[PDB]
Amino acid sequence: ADYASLVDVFVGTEGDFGNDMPAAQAPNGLAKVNPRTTPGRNNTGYDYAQSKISGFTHTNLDGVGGSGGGGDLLVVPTSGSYTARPGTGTYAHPFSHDDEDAGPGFYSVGLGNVAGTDGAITGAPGTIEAEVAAATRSGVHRYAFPAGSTPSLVVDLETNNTSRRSSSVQVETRADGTVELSGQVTGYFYNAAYTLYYTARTLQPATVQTWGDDDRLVDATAQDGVDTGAILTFDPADAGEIGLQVTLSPVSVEQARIDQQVELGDLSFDAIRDRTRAEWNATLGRVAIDASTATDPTGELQRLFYTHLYRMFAMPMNATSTSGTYRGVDGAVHAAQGFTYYDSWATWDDFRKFSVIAYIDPALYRDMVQSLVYLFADAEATGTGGGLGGFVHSVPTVRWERSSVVVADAIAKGFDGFDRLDEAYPALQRLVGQYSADELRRGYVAGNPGASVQRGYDQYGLSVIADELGLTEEAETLREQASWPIEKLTKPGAWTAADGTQVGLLTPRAADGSWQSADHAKFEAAGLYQGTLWQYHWYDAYDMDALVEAMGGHEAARLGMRHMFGEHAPDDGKAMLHSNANEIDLQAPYLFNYTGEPSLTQKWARAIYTKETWNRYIATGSSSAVPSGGGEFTPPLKTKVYRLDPRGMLPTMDNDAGTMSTMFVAAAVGLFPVTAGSSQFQVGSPFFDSTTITYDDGSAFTVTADGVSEDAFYVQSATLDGATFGNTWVDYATVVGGADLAFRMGEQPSDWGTDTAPAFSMSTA
Residues that bind Ca ion (CB under 5 A): 582, 619, 654, 656
CA dist 409 and 432 (Å) reads 16
Cβ distance to Ca ion smaller for residue 83 or 624: 624
Cβ distance to Ca ion smaller for residue 287 or 660: 660
Report the Cα 501 to chain-centroid distance in Å.
Answer: 40
CA dist 540 and 500 (Å) reads 26
* Beta carbons within 10 angstroms of residue 246's beta carbon: 25
CB of residue 353 to Ca ion, shortest distance in Å:
12
Say whether the peptide bond before residue 316 is cis (omega within 30 degrees of 0): yes
Cβ distance to Ca ion smaller for residue 21 or 24: 21
Instruction: Give SS3 for 257.
Output: helix
CA dist 598 and 718 (Å) reads 13
CB of residue 656 to Ca ion, shortest distance in Å:
5
Q: If we measure between CA atoms, which residue out of 15, 33, 31 comes closest to residue 23?
A: 33
Mode of pairing for the β-strands spanning 32-37 and 242-249: unpaired
Residue 4 phi/psi, 5-degree rounding, is -55, -35
Which DSSP category does 531 fall into?
S
CB 127 within 8 A of CB 18: no
CB of residue 583 to Ca ion, shortest distance in Å:
5
CB of residue 741 to Ca ion, shortest distance in Å:
31
Residue 582 phi/psi, 5-degree rounding, is -135, 165
Cβ distance to Ca ion smaller for residue 21 or 133: 21
CB of residue 763 to Ca ion, shortest distance in Å:
29
CB of residue 134 to Ca ion, shortest distance in Å:
26
CA dist 74 and 605 (Å) reads 41
CA dist 752 and 140 (Å) reads 54
Q: Half-sphere exposure of residue 601, counting CA atoms within 13 Å on the CB side?
A: 30
Cβ distance to Ca ion smaller for residue 19 or 38: 19
CB of residue 663 to Ca ion, shortest distance in Å:
11
Cβ distance to Ca ion smaller for residue 16 or 656: 656
Cβ distance to Ca ion smaller for residue 431 or 619: 619
Cβ distance to Ca ion smaller for residue 18 or 449: 18
Cβ distance to Ca ion smaller for residue 633 or 725: 633
CA dist 294 and 728 (Å) reads 25
CB of residue 52 to Ca ion, shortest distance in Å:
29
Which positions ≥6 away from 23 have C-beta within 8 Å?
A: 9, 32, 33, 34, 35, 44, 46, 60, 107, 134
CB of residue 672 to Ca ion, shortest distance in Å:
18
Cβ distance to Ca ion smaller for residue 231 or 619: 619
Which positions ≥6 away from 178 have C-beta within 8 Å?
A: 201, 202, 203, 204, 205, 206
CA dist 180 and 184 (Å) reads 14
Q: What sign has the CA pseudo-torsion 30, 35, 39, 40? A: negative
CA dist 263 and 615 (Å) reads 46
CB of residue 408 to Ca ion, shortest distance in Å:
22
